[PDB]
Design a protein around this ligand. Sequence first.
Ligand SMILES: [Mg+2]
Ligand SMILES: [Mg+2]
Ligand SMILES: [Mg+2]
Ligand SMILES: [Mg+2]
Ligand SMILES: [Mg+2]
Ligand SMILES: [Mg+2]
Ligand SMILES: [Mg+2]
Ligand SMILES: [Mg+2]
Ligand SMILES: [Mg+2]
Ligand SMILES: [Mg+2]
Ligand SMILES: [Mg+2]
Ligand SMILES: [Zn+2]
Lengths: 152, 115, 108, 102, 59, 217, 304
Amino acid sequence: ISHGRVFRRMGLGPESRIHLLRNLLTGLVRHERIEAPWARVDEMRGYAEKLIDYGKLGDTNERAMRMADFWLTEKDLIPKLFQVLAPRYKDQTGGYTRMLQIPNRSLDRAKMAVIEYKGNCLPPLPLPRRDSHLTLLNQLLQGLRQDLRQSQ
Amino acid sequence: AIQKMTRVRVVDNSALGNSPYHRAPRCIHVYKKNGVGKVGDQILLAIKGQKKKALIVGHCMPGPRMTPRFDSNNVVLIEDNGNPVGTRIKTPIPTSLRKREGEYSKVLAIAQNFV
Amino acid sequence: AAPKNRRTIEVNRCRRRNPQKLIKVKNNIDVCPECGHLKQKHVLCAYCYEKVCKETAEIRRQIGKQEGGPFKAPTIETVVLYTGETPSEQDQGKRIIERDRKRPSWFT
Amino acid sequence: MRYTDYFVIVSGTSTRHLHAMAFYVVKMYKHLKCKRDPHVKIEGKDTDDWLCVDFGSMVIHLMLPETREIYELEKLWTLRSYDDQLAQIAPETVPEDFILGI
Amino acid sequence: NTRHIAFSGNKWEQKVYSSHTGYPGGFRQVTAAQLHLRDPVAIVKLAIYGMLPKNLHRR
Amino acid sequence: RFLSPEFIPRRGRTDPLKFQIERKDMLERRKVLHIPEFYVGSILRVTTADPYASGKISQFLGICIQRSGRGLGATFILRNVIEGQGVEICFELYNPRVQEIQVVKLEKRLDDSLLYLRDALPEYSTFDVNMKPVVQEPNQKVPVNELKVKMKPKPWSKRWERPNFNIKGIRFDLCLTEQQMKEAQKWNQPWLEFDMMREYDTSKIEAAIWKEIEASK
Amino acid sequence: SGTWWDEHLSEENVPFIKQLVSDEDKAQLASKLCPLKDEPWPIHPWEPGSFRVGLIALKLGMMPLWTKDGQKHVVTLLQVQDCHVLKYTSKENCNGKMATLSVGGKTVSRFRKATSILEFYRELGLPPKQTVKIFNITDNAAIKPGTPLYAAHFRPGQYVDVTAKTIGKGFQGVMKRWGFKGQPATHGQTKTHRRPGAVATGDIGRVWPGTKMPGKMGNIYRTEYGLKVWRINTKHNIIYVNGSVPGHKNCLVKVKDSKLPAYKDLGKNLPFPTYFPDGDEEELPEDLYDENVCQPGAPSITFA
RNA sequence: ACCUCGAUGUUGGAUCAGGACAUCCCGAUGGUGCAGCCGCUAUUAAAGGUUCGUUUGUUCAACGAUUAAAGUCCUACGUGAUCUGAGUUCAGACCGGAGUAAUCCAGGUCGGUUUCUAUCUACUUUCAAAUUCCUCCCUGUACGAAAGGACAAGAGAAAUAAGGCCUACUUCACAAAGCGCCUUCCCCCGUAAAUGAUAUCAUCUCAACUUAGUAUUAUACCCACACCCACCCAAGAACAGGGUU
Ligand SMILES: [Mg+2]
Ligand SMILES: [Mg+2]
Ligand SMILES: [Mg+2]
Ligand SMILES: [Mg+2]
Ligand SMILES: [Mg+2]
Ligand SMILES: [Mg+2]
Ligand SMILES: [Mg+2]
Ligand SMILES: [Mg+2]
Ligand SMILES: [Mg+2]
Ligand SMILES: [Mg+2]
Ligand SMILES: [Mg+2]
Ligand SMILES: [Zn+2]
């Protein structure tokens, strides 16, 4: 029995859970794109988004500094968080990270996800693209839309 | 809940209850179908080398909402007849004792404080 | 506990060869419109992804050369540049990374 | 005092005399009782000396003179915290630092 | 006219039909009369069924 | 602004409509009986109808020790030592039985629960049954009592020294030893301060409750 | 290959299709808000032995409710959402003693439903419902399909029966499933703490059928009998029922009149075919209450 | 008696029970040396129920407090591939006794290794149509010299059992739980009566027949069937199930 259990147990306990996630997050901050097991990417993903909001609070916020101190192990990334990442996402209220499913790991046969912060410098991931508006079905649907708008 | 082998406190002016002794009074028996005793229930006591019947008056275990909850297990020594051996009850007793089924009127009569 | 009698080949063959224990056919395969290799739907094309990751691998190598040592992640944004292209006016004031090859078609 | 409007104490000659009174009072009660007025129960029929009956807003105590001398119910209810019987008994306090000495 | 069958003697309410559900205490014993009221077809059905050979062809 | 704890709902999969229904019911009751702004440290005197009697009036005074529950069933618990007996009563806020709630002495304590007062010395929970209300100017900061309380011997109802309770209002120096303190530290869980998905922000939620409340009046 | 509705739609068409189908469910609900006006079936006055249709309600949650005697009764809240009549089957065709009425529940998406089911609902002229339950009715109780149903269908003082699928606890041990005592924790007891005891007697060379042993618990239909209806909110269509109701919150329950012998002929005054708000015979207030219920916004209770 | 059981012994206990009625309690009758209250005896009934401690390894028993009662059995004196090992059993030791001794003892006393990864059979949500105690009313009545003290009909409180649930309390905290809350519905097959023959009266009928007596059943629950991309889930070992407007 475990309905509405939100967090998935991960390491060799709750302390380890955090520690793995913190490592993943540290990587992602630094490199801006990271491949890891699908469960762990999904798990860390949330904390990644929550980090940008704390980063949006600014350098001056003492609370936000203490949070950044804990979650970034490199200590050189903390300036980057506050002077690179926070300014980048000024417009958006949410949705800073994208996650995708990529082929399974060779050794292990594990489900693998790539996670990246949006608007990075890197070459863009091959992304799922919906079919063109000029397709036969889309053209017939556009036909129906024309009918409804031109009726009134 | 006061069950078998529970220490209780005799809140009476009765000599037997207030007498200095090496043992605290112990609950021998509970007069209920299931062993647990709430307030108003009768229980048997081993005090000072004798058995005595007693009425439960307030207890530590939480009860219904607006009903009071005491910090000690308080009992009043009664005869088998129903006559309380003591004359006065210093400690407050819950008012709920009134509407409950049984012989409670006499104990209410000798009590000073209702909470 | 221990088996009381040897299981026959027929009994075993019924166990092993029922549809439950068989490999199920995958019906979610498609052609990658980009490269023409096979990809599963709902999953990124293995070929296309390798291609991206080899490019991004080399970019990260150039990042290391310029940064030159640990704990030196800059406090500006970054941009990557190829042979025969120049930073814009808005590109001014951010980290530049150079390349010795032409810009890929897919990377714009 | 959240008990009753009127408290009543009456004495009796003998045990069987007390039953006579209590049983008449309850019997007459039912006669004049309102429909919705709840039914009442006599207390302590097994008891020798003390009988009690509770009504809606009246409470009655039937006793011998013997039990009146030992309970002093009138004194309790007229003057609450100021009666002689409460004075003799004193609250017991645990010692400071919680050390007993012989 | 399976309802209008006749029994010889006191066989209407001497003769019982026994059946057990798998479950403990599942033994049910009903008289021919009381079974007849449940299902009129039942008596004839049970008689014929018992008369056929006890093989796989029976059913 | 002060919003009553009961109005802010817990994290759940309860549909919003259920809360809207309950809020309307609560607000109707608030019109009838004034609910005062009180905190966990504060002193309250509650007057109720007594069903075990023929509509006689009971008042009880004591110190609040906890405030919990949501919607109509939301409650608080009052403590007091009456003539050498500790008494605790849990009261429903929206019970029709209650006649009047008054704030006799409005103060916060260091911590949000005071259930340790059972284990504290008797006098810290002993409050005069007949005391005069003491009132302060409307636009004043809610005053905090920074009292720490002395304790009984170490067998307690709960192990208060453990950091999960996070009690700031106990004189630990007096009762515990240094080794006991460092023993308690084995249960620290320092990551829990920085767990980001563990937190519950009620900002937008409270805003919408305010919108409902201002509409009601 | 399997195809869902989005496979071949551009970003431009997706919002358009979404809004189009949303419009049509609203239009279909709009059409049927006037049952009596549209050519209905004959309405018969109630006589003894008659059974009427029920409802399909969603369990919102739970609340306290107070009575004048001062007692606290917990109520469960049941919201009637897009409840309609689907199909009528005569006593002949159903092969039952009673005729049957089909009732639909929570409105659901057309895109996730089966072909035939979509066809069925198209013929009706209503959007697809999540649950369907069948009610056993007498001949007089017949209601033309497509007719909506409302919470005021029930009135306070009425007792109801409530059936839903219980909360699913998956594969459970014998101890939590059947409340077996289990074995002591100390004094030896090697690797036996929660095990079922001796299963059966040694004489029998088997295990009796229907023995209690560890297995899948919950997730089955259970009914609660004789729940009093304390209160009706007419605006939101809320039924307030006494005590606990089976299944989780935001689940669909089947609620009908109580079957119990005590309340066998209590349906006299209760709106027989159904309650028709469109009738305008008397406009029902915001709320309906039982006599004993303390009104929210009424003066504080005295026992005087 | 027996070439039938047992090489991880047997007694108890734990857990979980299945069944019989020769019924301990609750139900229905007949008689009574049945005024009423308790009682005594017999017929019918196995749906349900049948307590907790102390002494002793206790099965027994005694003792204490209860109850409505604390039934009698059978099931390899049920059940140890589900569990203990307390007594009695192997290697050590002592008291007492036998014996020249080695050693022994139906006595007393201390210590002493309980394996198994389930192949097959069987089974793993069938239905609860719920039982009982107490208090009050009748009534303090009938009855009875008094003392005492009813039955049907009805009301309220509890306790357990089954099935659920989380608004409060509580362990806790997107939830799960009890110490908490909600619901819980048919009757018994023994006799008591008429009318009326054999046997013109009478007679309750293994006579024809007529009422207690339905001398058999409920009602309720479930009940449509795409894609089986992917995601989510109050659904879940996997699988399946629900939602995805
Ligand atoms: Mg692991
Ligand atoms: Mg404790
Ligand atoms: Mg246990
Ligand atoms: Mg072992
Ligand atoms: Mg163990
Ligand atoms: Mg021979
Ligand atoms: Mg042999
Ligand atoms: Mg018999
Ligand atoms: Mg035998
Ligand atoms: Mg065995
Ligand atoms: Mg040893
Ligand atoms: Zn490709």
